Structure 1
């Protein structure tokens, strides 16, 4: 997978993110690295105000611009959401909202934190000679002490890596189909299935490393955005950049390129529908890189691997391809069992509309089994 920026190890995730910035930018990174101690102690929406309009010009290699977008990113979430209890800033200062929106529009992205910012870039290996697990990794950044953003981004990150096992497989699937190689292809769809059958046991650590209460009450509030949120019905001013408030999505895994690519591949049309479910995940393609866009693009340009299985009436492929769509339902049936532990049960101590979405989606998967 050429200039699609796909790692043959961590896939869509960014490989060995930058842990540190240039020195030209050290009063960014000092906020960013003491956001709990500072939000709490109130001087954060006093310390932010008192900064000056830096310029992107210095940021050279990728990882820099990216980590830079992470840093600006969460600082915006602390400034806007405050202590995370309802005193909401509807104005992002001239001075923080101009290098953030340049650094963003440099990377064809929107000025707000995303999936690729705070799961795909926000990580480091504790020892860069052992392997990528929970016990040998740590996040760069967090919002408040005891929010578990270790558990969230790390577990969430770990999975996207278990799907990468199957991304290096896509190249060979369509090869088999073209050169017509019934055998070769049946394999690729079983490897592809084999991975997501495992990216499930990944998901299980969530229960070891996150707390229902902490995720519903703490994290979530800082991840929200200003699109259809009612605390900022009109959006968020971006000072000396848009005199008009600008709505933007919260941060969702609806911005992840794996899953979205495996629906593309497996002929499951989650984008097509006009329904709320499918309108969203199309408008989240925006909140994804460009290079991870143009890969879901070149997939959808590909001949439906579903059709080519239906035809052949070859109960082998018929079965192997169902293994992949069995795999994907399996996972979103878990991802609903977590959401009831981690958003519904606590909310009883917006709501539903979230689960309908997540079911609307489990379903459209199912209805592609042969």
Structure 2
């Protein structure tokens, strides 16, 4: 595509993100890399309260401003959720609060671990001269041992890389519509469908590397935020930045541009209506990087691929379009079954509005089939 910071190889992810900061900031990363055994010992909160306020004026490139936001975001999650059994810190220490916020609002992100931090900037290749498989990859940061966070972040990133392969044929879709290149558009839409289809096969790998009683009971709590949470009723205080507490939702895959872009490409207005789902997905855009909003906004301001394919009466076109929407329905319906496996049944051993929420998005997707 364009300078929207989209890689041809990994798409919206950060290509080969940085693992080490300037040693100026080694006080920070010492904490982050040893979080699994700093939380167990009741000494993570104390060592955070010890650190003195470092300045953000020495983050040179963009790749280490991201790495900094990941470290500062992972510490912030570990500090406020503690061991994970209902002990909550409602005020973030001053000497890490204002470094987190000063950086965050220079990348136009909210001061909390978002999807682009802990997934897109949170990976590396085992052998740098090797492909992109679950074997040859490893996550840079985890919360506590045995939380399956390496499985969760990676297979989510792997299908992100899988679907993002279709991003570089989006410009083909829009210009085939402009020059009336029917055959090109048809092949373009078919290629998009093959990517969303194989992004579902990569999505099967979650049964192998994430365990339900693990995800629900440890990794869920560290990825929660302080927006509409009874544990942090009025939000979290960023000491020294805002005197009042600020609310921010936790990390979500709805904060991925790849996963929202195909809905606006195919003309599925998932943001239309006053529904809680249409509202959530819109709010989650301000939790995406700025170049990633501008890409979704630019897709919105293009002629509807749907209404174009609708007007042609082309049974070939209308099947290639229906192929893409069937791939999103299958993904969302298979995604519904794992929510039964990884939230519903673990919670058994309120929560019914979650399935309604997701079924709302699936139904709107499935109500966009042409024929």
Could you tell me how far apart the structure 2 residues matched to 1:161 and 1:175 are?
24
Could you tell me how far apart the structure 1 residues matched to 2:353 and 2:77 are?
24
Query: Per-residue deviation at 1:212?
Result: 0.4
User: Counterpart in 2 of 1:20?
Assistant: 20
- For 1:316-348, what per-residue CA distance to the aligned partner results, in whole angstroms no more than 9, with x for missing partners? 011100000000001001101111011001100
- For 1:158-188, what per-residue CA distance to the aligned partner results, in whole angstroms no more than 9, with x for missing partners? 0000011100010100010001111110000
- For 1:22-78, what per-residue CA distance to the aligned partner results, in whole angstroms no more than 9, with x for missing partners? 100001001000001000000011110000111111001001000000000010001
Could you tell me how far apart the structure 1 residues matched to 2:194 and 2:175 are?
19
- For 1:107-160, what per-residue CA distance to the aligned partner results, in whole angstroms no more than 9, with x for missing partners? 001000000000101000001101011000000000000000100000000000
Q: How many residue pairs were aligned?
A: 370
State the SS of the aligned residue for 2:237: strand
Query: Per-residue deviation at 1:229?
Result: 0.6
The worse-fitting range, judged by mean Cα deviation, of 285-294 and 353-362 is 353-362
Could you tell me how far apart the structure 2 residues matched to 1:156 and 1:21 are?
25
Within-5 A mapping of 1:208-223: 208-223=208-223
State the SS of the aligned residue for 1:329: helix
User: Counterpart in 1 of 2:166?
Assistant: 166
Could you tell me how far apart the structure 2 residues matched to 1:37 and 1:352 are?
35
- For 1:180-215, what per-residue CA distance to the aligned partner results, in whole angstroms no more than 9, with x for missing partners? 111110000000000011001101111110100000
State the SS of the aligned residue for 2:194: helix
Could you tell me how far apart the structure 2 residues matched to 1:355 and 1:50 are?
43
Could you tell me how far apart the structure 2 residues matched to 1:66 and 1:352 are?
36
When residues 99 and 350 of structure 1 are mapped into structure 2, their CA distance, relative to the original with a 3 A threshold, is: farther
Could you tell me how far apart the structure 2 residues matched to 1:14 and 1:119 are?
9
State the SS of the aligned residue for 2:287: coil
Query: Per-residue deviation at 1:306?
Result: 0.1
Could you tell me how far apart the structure 2 residues matched to 1:260 and 1:354 are?
18
Could you tell me how far apart the structure 1 residues matched to 2:218 and 2:334 are?
22
TM-score (norm 1): 0.99
Query: Per-residue deviation at 1:350?
Result: 5.4
Could you tell me how far apart the structure 2 residues matched to 1:257 and 1:227 are?
21
When residues 269 and 78 of structure 1 are mapped into structure 2, their CA distance, relative to the original with a 3 A threshold, is: same
User: Counterpart in 2 of 1:253?
Assistant: 253
State the SS of the aligned residue for 2:95: coil
State the SS of the aligned residue for 2:285: coil
When residues 206 and 309 of structure 1 are mapped into structure 2, their CA distance, relative to the original with a 3 A threshold, is: same
Query: Per-residue deviation at 1:304?
Result: 0.3
Higher helix share: 2
State the SS of the aligned residue for 1:25: helix
Gaps of 5+ in 1: none
Could you tell me how far apart the structure 1 residues matched to 2:25 and 2:253 are?
29
User: Counterpart in 1 of 2:81?
Assistant: 81
- For 1:271-303, what per-residue CA distance to the aligned partner results, in whole angstroms no more than 9, with x for missing partners? 111110000100000000000000001000000
Query: Per-residue deviation at 1:233?
Result: 1.1
Could you tell me how far apart the structure 1 residues matched to 2:369 and 2:287 are?
30
The worse-fitting range, judged by mean Cα deviation, of 13-22 and 342-351 is 342-351
When residues 271 and 81 of structure 1 are mapped into structure 2, their CA distance, relative to the original with a 3 A threshold, is: same
- For 1:232-288, what per-residue CA distance to the aligned partner results, in whole angstroms no more than 9, with x for missing partners? 010000000000000001110010101211001000001111110000100000000
